[PDB]
Design a protein around this motif. Structure first.
Motif, PDB file in Angstrom:
ATOM      1  N   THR A  95       8.901  20.072   2.833  1.00  0.00           N
ATOM      2  CA  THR A  95       9.477  21.115   1.957  1.00  0.00           C
ATOM      3  C   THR A  95      10.326  22.102   2.748  1.00  0.00           C
ATOM      4  O   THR A  95       9.973  22.495   3.851  1.00  0.00           O
ATOM      5  CB  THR A  95       8.430  21.885   1.144  1.00  0.00           C
ATOM      6  OG1 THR A  95       7.518  22.520   1.986  1.00  0.00           O
ATOM      7  CG2 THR A  95       7.649  20.971   0.209  1.00  0.00           C
ATOM      8  N   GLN A  96      11.455  22.550   2.198  1.00  0.00           N
ATOM      9  CA  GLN A  96      12.451  23.279   2.992  1.00  0.00           C
ATOM     10  C   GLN A  96      12.003  24.644   3.523  1.00  0.00           C
ATOM     11  O   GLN A  96      12.510  25.087   4.547  1.00  0.00           O
ATOM     12  CB  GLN A  96      13.769  23.377   2.225  1.00  0.00           C
ATOM     13  CG  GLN A  96      13.733  24.159   0.911  1.00  0.00           C
ATOM     14  CD  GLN A  96      15.139  24.416   0.395  1.00  0.00           C
ATOM     15  OE1 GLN A  96      15.532  25.541   0.150  1.00  0.00           O
ATOM     16  NE2 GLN A  96      15.975  23.416   0.261  1.00  0.00           N
ATOM     17  N   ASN A  97      11.003  25.285   2.919  1.00  0.00           N
ATOM     18  CA  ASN A  97      10.398  26.488   3.481  1.00  0.00           C
ATOM     19  C   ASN A  97       9.771  26.238   4.852  1.00  0.00           C
ATOM     20  O   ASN A  97       9.735  27.156   5.657  1.00  0.00           O
ATOM     21  CB  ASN A  97       9.372  27.074   2.511  1.00  0.00           C
ATOM     22  CG  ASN A  97       8.126  26.233   2.397  1.00  0.00           C
ATOM     23  OD1 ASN A  97       8.176  25.094   1.967  1.00  0.00           O
ATOM     24  ND2 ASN A  97       7.001  26.750   2.799  1.00  0.00           N
ATOM     25  N   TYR A 144      18.248  21.060   4.170  1.00  0.00           N
ATOM     26  CA  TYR A 144      18.510  19.809   3.445  1.00  0.00           C
ATOM     27  C   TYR A 144      18.018  18.584   4.222  1.00  0.00           C
ATOM     28  O   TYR A 144      17.402  17.709   3.628  1.00  0.00           O
ATOM     29  CB  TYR A 144      19.999  19.561   3.198  1.00  0.00           C
ATOM     30  CG  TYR A 144      20.821  20.463   2.314  1.00  0.00           C
ATOM     31  CD1 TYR A 144      20.377  21.708   1.823  1.00  0.00           C
ATOM     32  CD2 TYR A 144      22.104  19.994   1.984  1.00  0.00           C
ATOM     33  CE1 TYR A 144      21.219  22.470   0.989  1.00  0.00           C
ATOM     34  CE2 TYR A 144      22.935  20.734   1.135  1.00  0.00           C
ATOM     35  CZ  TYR A 144      22.492  21.967   0.632  1.00  0.00           C
ATOM     36  OH  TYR A 144      23.306  22.644  -0.209  1.00  0.00           O
ATOM     37  N   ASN A 158      14.296  18.375   3.548  1.00  0.00           N
ATOM     38  CA  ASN A 158      14.026  17.755   2.247  1.00  0.00           C
ATOM     39  C   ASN A 158      14.236  16.235   2.285  1.00  0.00           C
ATOM     40  O   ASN A 158      13.446  15.492   1.713  1.00  0.00           O
ATOM     41  CB  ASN A 158      14.928  18.351   1.154  1.00  0.00           C
ATOM     42  CG  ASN A 158      14.501  19.685   0.590  1.00  0.00           C
ATOM     43  OD1 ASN A 158      15.312  20.575   0.396  1.00  0.00           O
ATOM     44  ND2 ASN A 158      13.248  19.866   0.252  1.00  0.00           N
ATOM     45  N   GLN A 168      11.917  28.506  11.924  1.00  0.00           N
ATOM     46  CA  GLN A 168      13.295  28.229  12.334  1.00  0.00           C
ATOM     47  C   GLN A 168      13.529  28.428  13.827  1.00  0.00           C
ATOM     48  O   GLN A 168      14.154  27.585  14.461  1.00  0.00           O
ATOM     49  CB  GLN A 168      14.265  29.081  11.510  1.00  0.00           C
ATOM     50  CG  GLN A 168      15.726  28.723  11.818  1.00  0.00           C
ATOM     51  CD  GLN A 168      16.707  29.544  11.005  1.00  0.00           C
ATOM     52  OE1 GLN A 168      16.511  29.822   9.837  1.00  0.00           O
ATOM     53  NE2 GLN A 168      17.805  29.964  11.587  1.00  0.00           N
ATOM     54  N   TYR A 186      12.677  27.260   7.271  1.00  0.00           N
ATOM     55  CA  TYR A 186      12.940  28.696   7.304  1.00  0.00           C
ATOM     56  C   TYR A 186      11.769  29.516   7.864  1.00  0.00           C
ATOM     57  O   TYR A 186      11.988  30.528   8.520  1.00  0.00           O
ATOM     58  CB  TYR A 186      13.291  29.185   5.902  1.00  0.00           C
ATOM     59  CG  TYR A 186      14.493  28.526   5.264  1.00  0.00           C
ATOM     60  CD1 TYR A 186      15.751  28.588   5.887  1.00  0.00           C
ATOM     61  CD2 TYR A 186      14.359  27.881   4.026  1.00  0.00           C
ATOM     62  CE1 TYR A 186      16.876  28.015   5.265  1.00  0.00           C
ATOM     63  CE2 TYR A 186      15.483  27.344   3.385  1.00  0.00           C
ATOM     64  CZ  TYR A 186      16.747  27.425   3.995  1.00  0.00           C
ATOM     65  OH  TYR A 186      17.837  26.964   3.339  1.00  0.00           O
ATOM     66  N   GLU A 187      10.525  29.088   7.654  1.00  0.00           N
ATOM     67  CA  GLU A 187       9.340  29.736   8.210  1.00  0.00           C
ATOM     68  C   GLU A 187       9.053  29.368   9.676  1.00  0.00           C
ATOM     69  O   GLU A 187       8.273  30.055  10.326  1.00  0.00           O
ATOM     70  CB  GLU A 187       8.124  29.441   7.324  1.00  0.00           C
ATOM     71  CG  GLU A 187       8.259  30.062   5.926  1.00  0.00           C
ATOM     72  CD  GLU A 187       6.995  29.842   5.085  1.00  0.00           C
ATOM     73  OE1 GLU A 187       5.902  30.284   5.503  1.00  0.00           O
ATOM     74  OE2 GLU A 187       7.077  29.245   3.990  1.00  0.00           O
TER      75      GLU A 187
END
Ligand SMILES: *[C@@H]1O[C@H](CO)[C@@H](O)[C@H](O)[C@H]1NC(C)=O
Lengths: 49, 56
Positions: free
Chosen positions: A19-21, A11, A14, A27, A24-25
């Motif tokens: 973009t939030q990926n 969040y 964003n 991290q 996660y990509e």
């Protein structure tokens, strides 16, 4: 309201227009860079009174 | 524009500030890459709204 911390940082990403990926990509790199940057706070205060 | 959420068995996408669960679909989600990278990814179907029309 509880949320997993890696999802909270997604969040925060964003909120800055990334973009939030991207979190996660990347991290483990983001967590390493954060833990390293907190380590420099200890060193700066343990020297620069 | 949401979070993935589960009632215990089903998976839904929700707006983040008010509980209103929607079916997980190609149109409320986006792809990036494959499952090997993401820490804590889950297996669930994603619906495609074209296919049951193209099946007519
Ligand atoms: C949460 O932690 C457990 C171990 O306690 C791990 O098996 C699981 O993959 C983790 N899930 C997420 C979403 O990070």
């Amino acid at each position: 309201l509880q949320i997993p911390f890696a999802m909270q940082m997604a969040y925060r990403f964003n909120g800055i227009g990334v973009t939030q990926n991207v979190l996660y990509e990347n991290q483990k790199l983001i967590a390493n860079q954060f833990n390293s940057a907190i380590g420099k706070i200890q060193d700066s205060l343990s020297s620069t009174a | 524009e949401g979070v993935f959420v589960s009632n215990g068995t089903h998976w839904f996408v929700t707006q983040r500030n008010f509980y209103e669960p929607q079916i997980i679909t190609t149109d409320n989600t986006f792809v990036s890459g494959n499952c090997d990278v993401v820490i804590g990814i889950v297996n669930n179907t994603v619906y495609d709204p074209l296919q049951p029309e193209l099946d007519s």
